[model samples]
Target chain A: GETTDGVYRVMTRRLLGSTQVGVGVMQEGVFHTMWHVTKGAALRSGEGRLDPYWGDVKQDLVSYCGPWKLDAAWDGLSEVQLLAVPPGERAKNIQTLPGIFKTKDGDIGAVALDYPAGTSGSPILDKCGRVIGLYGNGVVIKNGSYVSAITQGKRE
Target chain B: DMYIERAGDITWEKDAEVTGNSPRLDVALDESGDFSLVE
Candidate 1:
């Protein structure tokens, strides 16, 4: 299954603290996640591969994907699912959350799902199993979390 | 090759400035791993 999954655990050792989050990056060198995961950290895949990153930073997004290829696949899948690192699990254990593809269309995308700590930076996928956005923030509202939408650009 | 693909036009530039014209699109996902979207 080398050409199947692309959800990765994002680990980093920052000046103030350490971080463990989820990310959906292609083995073909396309990275998709929140800017926080790419900021000031030499990123590594859950498979222990060093993913050198240098991309655009905005309010909460990274434009370009990284350079290193991942251990898993990045193109073509069977269904739509949100890839994330669930609670009480290491980065190596990625949780494939099912999505119903609801579209309350707007500029800033949001995810209405229940996610615990260490679940940020996950990718919001479409019905074609493609990334639509990245999970940004957690909230206490009825049934929603913050998701940063992917803007148009060269993702290679 | 059961891999996921990239959706829509996700085009952008490096270090783009934000003008605060942010909008919102609410979606949902669950861990049941049984949900399906009509393709």
Candidate 2:
């Protein structure tokens, strides 16, 4: 009935195009955002053993999994736009911490939000009860509909 | 042949059904043992 200690966080960084717009040359701009999550303290214990659904206690900043997309105006006229599907299934997988057990289940995790090139935002919960990250240029969804398009960030 | 000088600390021990790998004495730390002179 309680939640687990597992948590998932998502973040994004982008480069924007410049436009003269009748003025002098405009330099390129940068945008950054982040999301943080936790398995509420009232629901479960932080140091408890792993359950059937979730795996070991993985608190390290491991990886990023999401449905990522990069879009730039092919015509070279419009400003470049990058879009990422709500972190649906990917967030579930991270929250679930699958591949270790078969019958365990955990609650939605918390989220940490950072936006506008170092300007951080308060954490917000998605419809599915998980948290999300909203930035100036893009939004990272942790839980909700749409699960098939999520992608995992490279581990280097 | 290398002999079992002593049994070291065991982290976890379970039956064959629970263990995935076979139990075998595959390591020898003595430099004067048979394995060292085999090559």
Candidate 3:
């Protein structure tokens, strides 16, 4: 497949001089996931949830994007792997059959879906390593000692 | 089509003066990407 101006790209960032953590997507003529990812960095699902406001500097960053990148809306797929660059770190091996993808609520901007603890703000890839959806966020399906699961599906 | 926002050159004119040793207001982006007020 070919990539256009806002096709799909993963940006790796090392914030606060820390480890290579977090990822952002280029879309909607802007860069989304960065603000949310920066906030979700260095914290587990619970901690990431505890933080009231998860955001990067507003004017500090130039843009933001939403669920404008999912293909045919993940046309009849049961699962997908979230991917990140510098591929040494762990990417969430997610299973969608045990999961659910539903309509987005409010101004979420991305399709609402429940998924894994992969790279925060990373892209969901197919079996052949092509992008399918952008990992949105992991909400509290807090049943037990649970990890962060992605809360939204991506665009286009 | 994707939604894209481009913030162009921001221009502001004079507002009513305040008391004390002059005053200034600035347009700054908050952590959540909103226009914030700083005096």
Most TM-score-accurate candidate: 1
If you assessed candidate 3 against the hidden native complex, which CAPRI class would it receive? Answer: incorrect
Computed on alpha carbons, the lDDT of every model, listed in order, comes to 0.40, 0.17, 0.33
The model with the greater lDDT, 1 or 3, is: 1
- Which ten residues in a row are the worst by lDDT in model 3 chain A? A43-52
Rank ordering of all candidates by DockQ, starting from the highest: 1, 3, 2
User: Against the true structure, candidate 2 has what lDDT?
Assistant: 0.17
Candidate 3 lDDT, tens digit per residue, B1-39?
112111111111122111111112222333454333333
Q: Which stretches in model 1 have alpha-carbon errors above 4 Å?
A: A1-5, A12-19, A45-54, A63-80, A90-106, A138-156, B1-39
By lDDT, the best candidate is 1
* lDDT digits (tens) for residues A1-156 of candidate 2: 212112212222222332110000000211111222211111111332211221112210111121211111122121111111123221111111101101122221112222223222112222232223221212223332111101111212
CAPRI tier of model 1: incorrect
Lowest lDDT block of 10, candidate 2 chain A: A19-28
Individual DockQ of the candidates? 0.04, 0.01, 0.04
Off by over 4 Å in 2: A1-116, A120-122, A136-156, B1-39
For model 3, the local distance difference test gives: 0.33
lDDT of 1: 0.40
Quote the positional error of residue B29 for candidate 1 in Å: 23
